[PDB]
Amino acid sequence: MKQGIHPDYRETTVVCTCGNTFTTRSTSQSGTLNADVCSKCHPFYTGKQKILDAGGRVARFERRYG
Amino acid sequence: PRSLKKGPFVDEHLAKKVTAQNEAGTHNVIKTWSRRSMVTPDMIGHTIGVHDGRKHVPVFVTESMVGHKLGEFAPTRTFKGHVK
Amino acid sequence: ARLIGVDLPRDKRLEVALTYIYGIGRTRATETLKATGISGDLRVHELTDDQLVALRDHIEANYHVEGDLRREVAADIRRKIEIGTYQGRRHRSGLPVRGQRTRTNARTRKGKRKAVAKKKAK
Amino acid sequence: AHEMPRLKKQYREQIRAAMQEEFGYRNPMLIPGLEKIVVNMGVGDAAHDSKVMDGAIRDITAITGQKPQVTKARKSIAQFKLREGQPIGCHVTLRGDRMWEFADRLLTLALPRIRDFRGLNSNQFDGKGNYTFGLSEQVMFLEIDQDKIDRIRGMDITFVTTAQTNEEGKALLKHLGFPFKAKD
RNA sequence: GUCGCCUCCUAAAGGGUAACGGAGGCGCCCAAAGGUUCCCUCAGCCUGGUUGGUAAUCAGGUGGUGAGUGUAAGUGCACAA
RNA sequence: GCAUGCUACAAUGGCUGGUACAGAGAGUGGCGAGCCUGUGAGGGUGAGCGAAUCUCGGAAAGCCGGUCUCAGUUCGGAUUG
Ligand SMILES: [Mg+2]
Ligand SMILES: [Mg+2]
Ligand SMILES: [Mg+2]
Ligand SMILES: [Mg+2]
Ligand SMILES: [Zn+2]
């Protein structure tokens, strides 16, 4: 590393507002990181959406007629 | 659209023809002028010649047709564009 | 990135900042506020993260919003196209689908008037 | 400060053991590992002004943590409207601790908050165990500010690993943890 | 139309060699495009990648000269000139 | 393409709660109150009235309180699911 050309880069706590706190390092100037969602918190792979689709075209028919 | 408590409207001769086709083999084209009728699962996999005003255009009814009228698949006007 | 995929605009009341979300309208936002028990007359910049995430959870649980609803709508239109209904044919033609007249204006679907030369009188 | 990163520790213990057991390398220094991370951004709409390059430098500096290398145009092109020697892109090479902690930060924080995030394709490997992908938008890196960015920009992220083959590269990056769908 | 200078061919493996023979250039440019020292290897092709396309920037693989050389051409130059 | 209109482009306004003041007309396969049900269109029951009697019925603008604060908007309401 060359002195005086790189940004401030020091110890950095992150809190994910989902029970997760970690001790990474980043350039977050005079401060830390207050995330909105974590990896182990995001509904993507923790598996909390399961949208797939709604392909029951006939199922709609017997839903409103059967 | 039609009221739910009145049920779907199938023109009561298309129904009997498709039921006869089901009983005796789902292989024939059913010629009808009933653009008025509602596609139903009981006719799925059939081919129906829907009148469009001058000709009975055939439609092969698939799974997704069910929530539609027979006449939706037999366009009545031809445009092709202005000029050429 | 305040809510699901949209940033609520600051200095605007919550009851309409919610409607700023795709898939949320006036009555949908009003319900959301009554369910979450959050006032609707306070500006968004005074919003604690706990109530913000409670509102987010309610919206995500009850409502199709943003990318999900946009993809669902696009899928519905594409299904009409691929099934070939009259509405699907009108969609492919880029022409009104709900039985609107097309002789005179139909302008919001036909775009701007691309006037064409016609026959000339004597 | 002196502390060997969480992601590096996880890699060493768990991933080296897992690769040694489920690829059966006959030599201990054959287990693949991350060699470097390259963060590129081509900002080609810099042939008409310099402020865009300044914003890109600020953004990439904040995201990575070191000054970027600014590449000048190798050849001029009229239809792209760039002259010779104009700065049209900037990139950063991360190795060692900076590599490990930037990867940890990225995976744990940033791409989780992609709009309608659906994961990353598993078929974006170069064919030699290295995986490169692209982010269409930048402020999603919450290590930067929000209400002062000049304009939205994107970037390319490349993980170069000492993996001989694509399948073992995919295994390594899966064990490190990426959102990997089952789609093309 | 041409007249001085430069490069190639004619020119018959030293040099030289004519025609209103065949091809082109020059009347500059550069305070670095000079001196020195250290470092580097290209073009093309293949694969992957936000904007981005054949081709901008990035990664890996390949690739010895086919790139490059301020300016014509030849002789050179990758040991790099 | 033309023509006649409607709704607009907002603050003399939008939204919301409360609260005043009409006329002229229509009605038995009709006008339907009241009650119950539904977010609502409506549905179920269903009196009354061939009607200066009963029903359509609520008049709206306005006034009053709250709110929005000049934003392509809490304007506009086209289009589309
Ligand atoms: Mg000679
Ligand atoms: Mg000789
Ligand atoms: Mg002589
Ligand atoms: Mg009468
Ligand atoms: Zn989280």
Side-chain angles (χ1 to χ4, degrees), chain A residues 15-18 34-38 41, chain C residues 1-3 49 52-53 56, chain D residues 109 113 142:
Chain A
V15 60
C16 168
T17 70
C18 59
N34 297 295
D36 315 313
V37 70
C38 47
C41 198
Chain C
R2 297 292 299 274
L3 264 293
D49 291 331
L52 185 71
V53 298
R56 186 273 304 278
Chain D
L109 278 299
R113 64 193 215 86
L142 61 87

Side-chain angles (χ1 to χ4, degrees), chain D residues 35-53:
Chain D
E35 160 161 338
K36 72 169 165 277
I37 306 311
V38 182
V39 193
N40 186 2
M41 64 183 73
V43 298
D45 63 358
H48 65 279
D49 60 338
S50 70
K51 299 289 94 176
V52 56
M53 184 63 73

